[PDB]
Symmetry: D2
Subunit: 223 residues, 4 copies
């Protein structure tokens, strides 16, 4: 049924689980959960607790850590969730590698490669979608402040014609809270977290951070 | 120009470099070199030394050791070869992972996954191809004897209509000789060779092997 | 000198100021204990106040190879002939004979540390007037006891013959320690890039998960 | 007993037959040297001939953590109270003081090894009638001196007071060693699964490439 963006104002401070219920209400089993094989496993845990038939997809860029592959499959055989593992389109990837190597992002910035292995296939998925949710968090951002809202129009894949709504349940959640959650209920997590990795991306563009170092500095550090 | 399969009887004992000259003679810049990011790097060195314009491709199953990606790119920047890195077809892969996970080969045998990530895209390549060479070696096989000939008709992708010739330069070259070669001319080699790896496949289906243990036992060991 | 006077004045002063106090009163006889971890900050600060700063490390013979490498790197870097002390085979041998090499897993680190660290420490400190350590209040979840920037070492000194102990970094925080490390581009243990915050011996230390307290990475089974 | 006679008779016999010989003449006074590597074969064989088999290991204090775990795993497995010996701080401390922790990189493993292995070895063997090692002709690229299955230990015994040394695996080859290991499912160092064939201290050992000789992974810089 119809609604207004004022809902996004209503769910501003509501707990993540409640924000999820909201989404599950309006969009039912049509809500897709974006799972990156990282601490966002919490979003998968909450979502799955509310809905045992929750739909979730992971963007396999073909360059994920072997640890991340093992984990995604783990969350799969743990919650009984046939995850949608999306791969890149060769006709897009192949030419890129061909003239630029398998590490162009080091000299051309991560933009291009991401766009082909991550962004493009994501766009393709969200097409036949009404709304989806990601575990993005306010605090996992440098500190430019809190830019993420719990509910908003997907300003990247949305069109006045075919609008796409996006939920960010873990927006107001802190890293410490995320880990308390995962540790408390003993959720499975990426092995990389026991090696100095807070923020997890693709193997070649992600590195561990030092004690007290912000998690974002473990991503595209050369940039 | 035309030739007879007696040539395959001729090159039998000749050195790999000769077999490559022979190959380059008949098929020229059209002869493709299959590069797996492993000790077959020797083939690349030999072919490239003869033909600085040598064409080469590698099948990126989307599940290679990060060590492998870094190597393939090294050979690329080391020799000055715009290698062709081939990726799997989403429309073929995605469905497999959806209902079986990312480690099905552990219980269903490796055949199916290899078929989609490795074999299929290999076929799509050898299409517009007259002949190609791989670094397959006799001794790199368990011991069911020497089954590889230096030259033969591709018994997997060749057809009476459109034939495909395949060379195996390193056929008669022993492991010791392959490494004596690489170490001698100081070629670059996969970092994994320093961690116990002799034979290198994808990350999930490859494990290092013990002292004296055969190099084939580090591949699909569960089968 | 005046223990109570100094213990008070120094209380809220900077680590550098505490070290200036220590060197001023004990000079080239103030020993700096270096465990091959974040306390490198202590070594650095002390080294800048006194190039000749005596320093020593307890080699329990079970440290992470990364720690052996780091300690030496510090040695070479600042040009400090660190005194790397080892266990007494006459004490360690019988312990390993009977209980093996990982007894501390079932008996608690008490015994082993007693023989590999403490006893060799006692011998060293025994012929010393004063020493310092990188112990920070910050390192324990602030329990019943806190670190004194200056104090009488109750553990290794007789009422009649006292030993003084300085903990300059007492009030410095983890974040401040690392900011210092990173800002001044100091050299640090490699383990710190693999999830290790606190750094003990290889068998009794483990990296910690994000946000997990650093002390939760030492003798975790206890 | 008859050294020359026995050295000859044993020459071509099996490793077990050589251990049987050693035990028969020295019983519970024959020490088996275990370094935490493939020599586990020697331990397994000797253990099966004599459960009470004395066994010792030289803890240079710089061994691989994996080696520490393995040595203890063997201990626990066969139920052997292995004698893990350590260096003499009165000798090591001053070496590390002056030269640091990696002097061997620039002076050659001589001096260090001399203090962390040899010196403590001598002491041990000083009150021993005979011992045995896992040394094999196979381990060195067949140089000027080979391994006698039995011999006088000229290195550690005075002409008047001799010491006898047995090398049961003298003639056993790497390939055979591992077949034995894998066949009887013996426990082995983890570093074997990481490219290590020969295994010494962490800083002086390194894995070898395929077909590269195992000795090339020890003191490679020399
Ligand atoms: N490759 C991916 N596959 C699935 N979900 C993803 C992927 N990347 C990001 N996400 C979503 O976005 C959040 C993590 O985003 P990031 O990985 O932090 O974005 S990134 O651009 O920096 O890589 C998670 O809460 C997750 O739901
Ligand atoms: N995925 C691949 N991409 C490119 N070349 C390959 C690939 N796999 C095998 N080859 C070629 O075949 C040889 C290695 O074959 P293998 O990897 O040993 O075959 S396999 O069946 O075990 O995977 C090398 O000399 C190499 O040229
Ligand atoms: S994170 Fe790096 S490897 Fe991954 S998609 Fe972006 S550019 Fe490519
Ligand atoms: S080696 Fe394993 S991971 Fe790679 S293609 Fe074959 S089945 Fe799949
Ligand atoms: S920390 Fe562990 S290994 Fe090190 S001295 Fe203490 S008990 Fe022994
Ligand atoms: S092998 Fe290296 S570290 Fe070990 S005793 Fe010898 S020189 Fe020292």
């Amino acid at each position: 049924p119809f609604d207004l963006p004022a809902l996004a104002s209503s769910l501003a401070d509501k707990s993540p689980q409640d924000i999820l219920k909201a989404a599950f209400e309006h969009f039912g089993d049509e809500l897709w959960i974006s799972f990156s094989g990282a601490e966002d496993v919490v979003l998968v845990d909450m979502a799955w607790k509310l809905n045992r038939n929750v739909k979730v997809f992971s963007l396999d860029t073909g360059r994920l850590h072997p640890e991340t592959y093992r984990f995604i499959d783990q969350v799969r055989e743990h919650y009984g969730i046939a995850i949608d593992v999306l791969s890149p389109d060769p006709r897009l990837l192949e030419p890129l590698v061909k003239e630029k190597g398998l590490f162009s992002f080091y000299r051309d910035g991560h933009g291009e490669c991401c766009g082909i292995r991550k962004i493009e296939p994501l766009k393709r998925k969200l097409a036949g979608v009404r709304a989806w949710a990601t575990g993005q968090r306010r605090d996992q951002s440098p500190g430019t402040r809190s830019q993420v809202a719990v509910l908003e129009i997907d300003g990247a894949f949305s069109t006045p014609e075919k609008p796409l709504y996006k939920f960010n349940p873990l927006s107001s959640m802190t890293s410490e809270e995320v880990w308390g959650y995962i540790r408390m209920l003993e959720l499975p997590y990426n092995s990389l977290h026991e090696r100095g990795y807070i923020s997890i991306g693709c193997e070649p563009c992600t590195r561990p951070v030092l004690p007290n170092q912000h998690e974002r500095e473990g991503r595209w550090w050369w940039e």
